[PDB]
Amino acid sequence: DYYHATKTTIFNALLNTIDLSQLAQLDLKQAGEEIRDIVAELVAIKNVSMSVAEQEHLVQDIINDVLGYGPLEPLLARDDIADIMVNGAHRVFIEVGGKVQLTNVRFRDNLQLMNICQRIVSQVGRRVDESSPICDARLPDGSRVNVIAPPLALDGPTLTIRKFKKDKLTMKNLVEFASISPEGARVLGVIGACRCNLVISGGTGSGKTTLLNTMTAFIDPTERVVTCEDAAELQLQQPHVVRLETRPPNLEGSGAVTMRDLVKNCLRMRPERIIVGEVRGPEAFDLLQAMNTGHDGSMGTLHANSPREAISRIESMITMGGYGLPSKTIKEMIVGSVDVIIQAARLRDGSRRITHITEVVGLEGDVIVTQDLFVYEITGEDEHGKVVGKHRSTGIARPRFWDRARYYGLERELAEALDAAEA
Amino acid sequence: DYYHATKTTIFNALLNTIDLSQLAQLDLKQAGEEIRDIVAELVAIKNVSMSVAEQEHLVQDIINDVLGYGPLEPLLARDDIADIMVNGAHRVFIEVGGKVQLTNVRFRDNLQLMNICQRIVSQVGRRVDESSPICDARLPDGSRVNVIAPPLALDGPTLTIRKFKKDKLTMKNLVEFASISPEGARVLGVIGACRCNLVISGGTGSGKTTLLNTMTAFIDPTERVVTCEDAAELQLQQPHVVRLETRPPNLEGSGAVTMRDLVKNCLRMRPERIIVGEVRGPEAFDLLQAMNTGHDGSMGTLHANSPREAISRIESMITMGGYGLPSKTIKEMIVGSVDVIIQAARLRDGSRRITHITEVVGLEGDVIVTQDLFVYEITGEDEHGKVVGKHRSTGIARPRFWDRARYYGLERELAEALDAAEA
Amino acid sequence: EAFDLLQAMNTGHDGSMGTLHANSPREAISRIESMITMGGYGLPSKTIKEMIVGSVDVIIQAARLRDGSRRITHITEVVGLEGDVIVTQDLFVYEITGEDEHGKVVGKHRSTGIARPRFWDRARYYGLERELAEALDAAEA
Numbered sequence: 011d012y013y014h015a016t017k018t019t020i021f022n023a024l025l026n027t028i029d030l031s032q033l034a035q036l037d038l039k040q041a042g043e044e045i046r047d048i049v050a051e052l053v054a055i056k057n058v059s060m061s062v063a064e065q066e067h068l069v070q071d072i073i074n075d076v077l078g079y080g081p082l083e084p085l086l087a088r089d090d091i092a093d094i095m096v097n098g099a100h101r102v103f104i105e106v107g108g109k110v111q112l113t114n115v116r117f118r119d120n121l122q123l124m125n126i127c128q129r130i131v132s133q134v135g136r137r138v139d140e141s142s143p144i145c146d147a148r149l150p151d152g153s154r155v156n157v158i159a160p161p162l163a164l165d166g167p168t169l170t171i172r173k174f175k176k177d178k179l180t181m182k183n184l185v186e187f188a189s190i191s192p193e194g195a196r197v198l199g200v201i202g203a204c205r206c207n208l209v210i211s212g213g214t215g216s217g218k219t220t221l222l223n224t225m226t227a228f229i230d231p232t233e234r235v236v237t238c239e240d241a242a243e244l245q246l247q248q249p250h251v252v253r254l255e256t257r258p259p260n261l262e263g264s265g266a267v268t269m270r271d272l273v274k275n276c277l278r279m280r281p282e283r284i285i286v287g288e289v290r291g292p293e294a295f296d297l298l299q300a301m302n303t304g305h306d307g308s309m310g311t312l313h314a315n316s317p318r319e320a321i322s323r324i325e326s327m328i329t330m331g332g333y334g335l336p337s338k339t340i341k342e343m344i345v346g347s348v349d350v351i352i353q354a355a356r357l358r359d360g361s362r363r364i365t366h367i368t369e370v371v372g373l374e375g376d377v378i379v380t381q382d383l384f385v386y387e388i389t390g391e392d393e394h395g396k397v398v399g400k401h402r403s404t405g406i407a408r409p410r411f412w413d414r415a416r417y418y419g420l421e422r423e424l425a426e427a428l429d430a431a432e433a
Numbered sequence: 434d435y436y437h438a439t440k441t442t443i444f445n446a447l448l449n450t451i452d453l454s455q456l457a458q459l460d461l462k463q464a465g466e467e468i469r470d471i472v473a474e475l476v477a478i479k480n481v482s483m484s485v486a487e488q489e490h491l492v493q494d495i496i497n498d499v500l501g502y503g504p505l506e507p508l509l510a511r512d513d514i515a516d517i518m519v520n521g522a523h524r525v526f527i528e529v530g531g532k533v534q535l536t537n538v539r540f541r542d543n544l545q546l547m548n549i550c551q552r553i554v555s556q557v558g559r560r561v562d563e564s565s566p567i568c569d570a571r572l573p574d575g576s577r578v579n580v581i582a583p584p585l586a587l588d589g590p591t592l593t594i595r596k597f598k599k600d601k602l603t604m605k606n607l608v609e610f611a612s613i614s615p616e617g618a619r620v621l622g623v624i625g626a627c628r629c630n631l632v633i634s635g636g637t638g639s640g641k642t643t644l645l646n647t648m649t650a651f652i653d654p655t656e657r658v659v660t661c662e663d664a665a666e667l668q669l670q671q672p673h674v675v676r677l678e679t680r681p682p683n684l685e686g687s688g689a690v691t692m693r694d695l696v697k698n699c700l701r702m703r704p705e706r707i708i709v710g711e712v713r714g715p716e717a718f719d720l721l722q723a724m725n726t727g728h729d730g731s732m733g734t735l736h737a738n739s740p741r742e743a744i745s746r747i748e749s750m751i752t753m754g755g756y757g758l759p760s761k762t763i764k765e766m767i768v769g770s771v772d773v774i775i776q777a778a779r780l781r782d783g784s785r786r787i788t789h790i791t792e793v794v795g796l797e798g799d800v801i802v803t804q805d806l807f808v809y810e811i812t813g814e815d816e817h818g819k820v821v822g823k824h825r826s827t828g829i830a831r832p833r834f835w836d837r838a839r840y841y842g843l844e845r846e847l848a849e850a851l852d853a854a855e856a
Numbered sequence: 857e858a859f860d861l862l863q864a865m866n867t868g869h870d871g872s873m874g875t876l877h878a879n880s881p882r883e884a885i886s887r888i889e890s891m892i893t894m895g896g897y898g899l900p901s902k903t904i905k906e907m908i909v910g911s912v913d914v915i916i917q918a919a920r921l922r923d924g925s926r927r928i929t930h931i932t933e934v935v936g937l938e939g940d941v942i943v944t945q946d947l948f949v950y951e952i953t954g955e956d957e958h959g960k961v962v963g964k965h966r967s968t969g970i971a972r973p974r975f976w977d978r979a980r981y982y983g984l985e986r987e988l989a990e991a992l993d994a995a996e997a
Contacts, residue, residue: 279591335741364500
């Protein structure tokens with residue numbers, strides 16, 4: 011009841027005594043203590059229906075106005091809310107238990123919201139205003155903030171926040187959700203630990219990224235990484251990561267940095283796992299060379315259905331590269347670099363499965379000989395509209411990289427998994 | 434633990450006495466005197482546990498605050514620090530002889546790191562900002578620096594400085610290091626002493642310049658040599674040498690001396706060999722003229738992965754020159770000029786080898802013909818983790834440049850080396 | 857922007873929409889391919905068709921009659937990619953019978969009589985399947 015008018019009076023009185031114009035003076039603690047005392051004194055000096063509880067509340071609200079986020083502080087705190095969505099200064103929604111709901115926490119007006127947004131984003135050296143009404147940011151708490159201003163958004167400043175995620179889609183989620191076998195899971199774990207290159211290919215909707223992220227989660231932390239993504243989608247877990255991104259054409263048809271330049275520049279910064287987001291232009295070439303010159307453990311993605319189609323696509327990309335190499339040298343390079351070409355595909359039942367786990371055995375004539383470590387053999391389709399199969403093995407005694415797995419000190423696990431898969 | 438707090442206090446005292454807002458006053462020497470004087474006065478009046486050495490360190494820290502590099506200096510001053518990696522404002526890693534770790538040295542604000550990067554690239558007339566967000570450079574002291582800007586790097590600026598090191602390899606030592614087999618060593622000695630227009634290609638981190646120095650160590654003394662470099666790296670061991678270097682554009686971007694102009698002028702100094710430090714632009718054109726109009730022995734290095742890409746890149750550069758030459762003319766010119774291409778590269782396991790020793794044979798329509806004498810054919814990898822190969826020989830009975838070998842009477846030794854290698 | 861929109865049709869935002877300028881659903885799909893190629897991402901010409909076959913699930917065509925009136929004409933779907941061409945299974949259509957004594961065009965809204973449309977499986981989730989079956993049956997009668 012008496013919160014609004016009393017808070018307005020406190021704001022006016024404190025501004026008269028010690029306003030924000032004293033910035034750089036009455037440091038955060040100093041201003042907090044002084045404002046608390048001034049509000050306590052004004053509650054009696056001026057008629058204030060705010061009792062002791064309302065007195066502490068007014069002190070807290072003054073702290074918020076001068077310093078804090080105000081109405082978002084509660085929701086930003088609560089642990090049952092993962093995502094917060096503010097549509098104009100009036101309506102705020104929250105994702106509780108995997109579903110959106112409305113809770114009335116209004117802002118004083120649009121100016122307040124458009125100031126809170128800047129105070130939020132600038133915490134990591136950004137700023138959003140009427141000369142750049144878009145903003146996105148990532149924070150130390152694993153969160154991600156996205157802000158749009160009133161020049162575009164009609165309703166009013168629109169904010170979206172996704173707070174900490176901790177249970178990233180680790181392998182066990184893939185396993186138990188009927189998309190990969192256990193022994194295959196251990197084989198993948200070893201393929202990732204042994205810094206053996208890999209390339210991921212999946213039909214439309216196969217979800218290349220999710221898989222690539224699950225794989226990156228394997229790298230040993232001591233290995234410096236450089237992820238040259240197209241849009242900031244990968245969410246790595248290591249301490250040593252280094253992000254990047256491209257830039258599209260400007261209004262004058264210039265000022266663009268295509269991913270080729272980024273992949274070229276990543277060579278300098280002494281990396282040890284040049285991860286990529288997607289391979290469409292000639293960048294393939296550069297990436298492959300990076301795989302060969304002593305960066306054992308890179309990754310990547312591309313669009314193709316069956317692994318052999320993936321190899322053909324890579325060769326087509328390089329040919330589009332405009333370098334004119336013979337059709338044999340390119341194949342030799344691919345056979346020398348790539349070590350596993352995982353697969354991912356979406357089946358008619360709407361699920362998502364890892365159909366193949368293919369290697370690159372070698373070069374023979376004009377055919378790059380490959381062998382498979384696992385495959386997805388369907389058995390039938392159920393009444394509920396599903397497609398069900400099984401992950402079949404091939405009892406292979408030794409892959410091409412067995413020596414490497416012997417080196418990095420995880421030799422047994424590979425054979426244990428491959429042999430026990432027959433169980 | 435008094436270092437940080439005392440330093441903050443002394444910085445505040447200096448700012449109150451002489452603040453950075455007084456720019457254009459208290460200049461280089463005036464500052465070097467007044468800052469030290471105020472520091473001594475504060476240390477005398479203001480009890481600081483810092484000693485005379487610590488007092489000098491604090492004085493230098495304030496000097497850095499004024500016009501310095503930021504906290505990089507205490508790192509750079511060391512010798513065990515072989516690499517400095519920034520990755521944003523909040524982290525600085527280092528490698529110390531085989532191991533790598535994090536350090537408890539940090540920056541204050543992305544403004545500090547960004548300004549330090551802009552300054553250190555202004556040392557060699559380079560500027561990195563929101564218009565050209567990428568900058569690679571080599572500082573005069575010898576070490577290499579790379580920097581990426583906020584628009585791409587999502588974590589603010591990212592900067593890497595690689596410690597300088599010296600190789601000075603020799604052809605008699607390369608054989609022990611297993612780079613080139615002794616038969617190859619004799620063949621290359623003949624190829625270098627016989628004034629053969631060659632081009633030493635190389636891939637990322639391959640280490641061309643060492644090879645180029647090792648090769649030029651074969652030149653006969655009296656020959657008047659002329660280089661054209663950008664960093665003053667080489668170390669020629671001949672009495673009659675003339676050295677050179679380009680002068681990048683001034684702060685206003687005017688009066689620049691591009692390697693092209695250096696070459697076009699070296700054409701008039703009566704040189705016998707025009708060595709070049711590297712090939713980046715249309716200067717190749719001029720160099721090719723030097724390769725053709727009676728300056729036999731000109732060398733040079735360009736960044737290419739395999740010879741049949743190096744040729745295409747040379748053609749692309751010449752076309753980019755904007756001369757309007759039809760492509761076929763460019764191919765004719767290259768076929769006429771170049772004589773040998775030595776493609777060196779770094780294999781996966783980190784070693785350095787010489788993979789190709791090729792000779793341009795001629796032109797047949799729209800395809801250039803090459804007759805690789807050697808190829809470092811990969812055989813396998815040992816159990817200890819290092820690859821294994823062998824320098825196979827195609828064993829051409831008489832290479833193209835045989836005539837030259839005759840004119841200098843060295844042909845017999847080349848024939849012996851071929852016979853040994855042919856088997 | 858069509859490409860980006862297709863991403864939304866793909867990465868679990870099922871329910872996107874859009875509007876574009878065309879006359880014949882095949883012409884509409886050709887226009888979409890042209891738009892995606894405009895971006896210059898370098899995609900081949902078959903992957904674009906794969907993307908458009910895996911993304912879209914209805915292509916409604918509405919038109920203006922020659923006479924000066926508007927009618928809804930096609931409720932075509934997308935069935936798949938057979939080789940290098942896209943296929944359709946137009947559910948409903950509107951056929952121009954002729955003219956009246958005044959001159960206005962006349963016609964009938966007809967259902968080709970397909971039994972289980974492609975999106976039927978999806979409609980199974982939301983318990984609409986019975987309603988769709990009933991409507992198609994009444995049309996077929």
